[PDB]
Amino acid sequence: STENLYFQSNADSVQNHTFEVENNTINGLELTEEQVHILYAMVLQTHADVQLLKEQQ
Amino acid sequence: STENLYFQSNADSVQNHTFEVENNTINGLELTEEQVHILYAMVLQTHADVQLLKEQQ
Amino acid sequence: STENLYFQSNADSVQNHTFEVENNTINGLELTEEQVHILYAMVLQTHADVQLLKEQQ
Amino acid sequence: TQWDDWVDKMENLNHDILTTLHTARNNLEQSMITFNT
Amino acid sequence: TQWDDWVDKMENLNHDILTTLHTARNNLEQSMITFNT
Amino acid sequence: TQWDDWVDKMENLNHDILTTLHTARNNLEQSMITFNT
């Protein structure tokens, strides 16, 4: 059953790498979201500094 | 035809959840992009405030 | 073998469009990451400007 | 203010992305389990 | 200026992401329709 | 400082995303090659 067994193995391999691509992509999205949270924090902090400067003027 | 019918049902289920993962991931990307647009706006606005401050100095 | 050939063609088409969705999504992530790098640069530059302003006060 | 509205939009998007990633992962887990039936 | 170039890069990326998401969704819709043939 | 820690976190995430995209693409390339066997 070599041929069939091999091609079933390939089909399973394609499916599993697809699961892996999806996992990688969801993880990538999660990482960009973490960077966005940091940028958001930096931006809020800079805004507070700027507001103080505007008052001090 | 129970066995075969069941496993065809599973194959369809795997395919459909794959469509759903892809839909979720595209939607997630679209959401991060919306946050990026907001951050970009906040950053541009802060830059304008900072420029005025530099002139006022 | 028309029926079978057609449905094998459809199966291949589904698989290939899946590869394309994955490629599009990875590319999209890569693009958002590039925007994040730019925002990060803009934010760092604005912070430096703000720091100078705080010293000048 | 325009700044307050951006903030409110940002918070709502934080929540939508959290739910969206959770759904994506749950759908991925379902497909793997089904595939390994 | 460096700031103007960042702005120009940001605008071009906004456009590329729009096209990329549209293509992703179109490819997804094609695969679903084909699968449901 | 809080600012320095944000910077350090940002740098580490830049690296993780680079590796993650490289892995995603490598897995995609593997699945295509296997499928076209």
Side-chain angles (χ1 to χ4, degrees), chain A residues 2-57, chain B residues 2-57, chain C residues 2-57, chain D, chain E, chain F:
Chain A
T2 302
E3 258 284 75
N4 162 33
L5 263 190
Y6 175 54
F7 288 147
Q8 156 188 305
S9 178
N10 286 344
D12 295 349
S13 184
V14 173
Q15 183 64 255
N16 285 317
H17 282 118
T18 290
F19 291 150
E20 287 187 320
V21 174
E22 292 176 339
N23 180 60
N24 299 146
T25 301
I26 296 158
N27 289 345
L29 256 174
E30 184 164 66
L31 292 170
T32 57
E33 180 66 5
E34 292 196 20
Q35 287 173 311
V36 161
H37 288 162
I38 291 160
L39 285 179
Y40 181 48
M42 302 169 93
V43 165
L44 286 177
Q45 170 72 42
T46 303
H47 179 70
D49 293 337
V50 167
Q51 295 306 103
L52 180 66
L53 286 171
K54 298 209 284 191
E55 288 283 341
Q56 287 170 337
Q57 220 59 20
Chain B
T2 302
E3 258 284 75
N4 162 33
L5 263 190
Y6 175 54
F7 288 147
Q8 156 188 305
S9 178
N10 286 344
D12 295 349
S13 184
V14 173
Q15 183 64 255
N16 285 317
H17 282 118
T18 290
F19 291 150
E20 287 187 320
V21 174
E22 292 176 339
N23 180 60
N24 299 146
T25 301
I26 296 158
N27 289 345
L29 256 174
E30 184 164 66
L31 292 170
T32 57
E33 180 66 5
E34 292 196 20
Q35 287 173 311
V36 161
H37 288 162
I38 291 160
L39 285 179
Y40 181 48
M42 302 169 93
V43 165
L44 286 177
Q45 170 72 42
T46 303
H47 179 70
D49 293 337
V50 167
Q51 295 306 103
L52 180 66
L53 286 171
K54 298 209 284 191
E55 288 283 341
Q56 287 170 337
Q57 220 59 20
Chain C
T2 302
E3 258 284 75
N4 162 33
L5 263 190
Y6 175 54
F7 288 147
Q8 156 188 305
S9 178
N10 286 344
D12 295 349
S13 184
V14 173
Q15 183 64 255
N16 285 317
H17 282 118
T18 290
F19 291 150
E20 287 187 320
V21 174
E22 292 176 339
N23 180 60
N24 299 146
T25 301
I26 296 158
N27 289 345
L29 256 174
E30 184 164 66
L31 292 170
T32 57
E33 180 66 5
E34 292 196 20
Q35 287 173 311
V36 161
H37 288 162
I38 291 160
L39 285 179
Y40 181 48
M42 302 169 93
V43 165
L44 286 177
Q45 170 72 42
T46 303
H47 179 70
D49 293 337
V50 167
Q51 295 306 103
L52 180 66
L53 286 171
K54 298 209 284 191
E55 288 283 341
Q56 287 170 337
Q57 220 59 20
Chain D
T1 61
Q2 128 188 103
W3 194 267
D4 287 335
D5 285 346
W6 283 335
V7 166
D8 287 352
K9 283 194 169 93
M10 186 60 62
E11 311 303 327
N12 292 343
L13 290 165
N14 285 354
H15 182 65
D16 295 338
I17 288 165
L18 268 175
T19 61
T20 298
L21 294 170
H22 183 265
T23 301
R25 285 187 170 113
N26 189 245
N27 280 316
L28 206 223
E29 197 60 44
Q30 299 185 262
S31 62
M32 294 178 69
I33 285 171
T34 298
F35 178 65
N36 288 283
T37 287
Chain E
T1 61
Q2 128 188 103
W3 194 267
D4 287 335
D5 285 346
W6 283 335
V7 166
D8 287 352
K9 283 194 169 93
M10 186 60 62
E11 311 303 327
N12 292 343
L13 290 165
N14 285 354
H15 182 65
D16 295 338
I17 288 165
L18 268 175
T19 61
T20 298
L21 294 170
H22 183 265
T23 301
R25 285 187 170 113
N26 189 245
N27 280 316
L28 206 223
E29 197 60 44
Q30 299 185 262
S31 62
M32 294 178 69
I33 285 171
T34 298
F35 178 65
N36 288 283
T37 287
Chain F
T1 61
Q2 128 188 103
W3 194 267
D4 287 335
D5 285 346
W6 283 335
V7 166
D8 287 352
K9 283 194 169 93
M10 186 60 62
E11 311 303 327
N12 292 343
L13 290 165
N14 285 354
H15 182 65
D16 295 338
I17 288 165
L18 268 175
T19 61
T20 298
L21 294 170
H22 183 265
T23 301
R25 285 187 170 113
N26 189 245
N27 280 316
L28 206 223
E29 197 60 44
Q30 299 185 262
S31 62
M32 294 178 69
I33 285 171
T34 298
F35 178 65
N36 288 283
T37 287

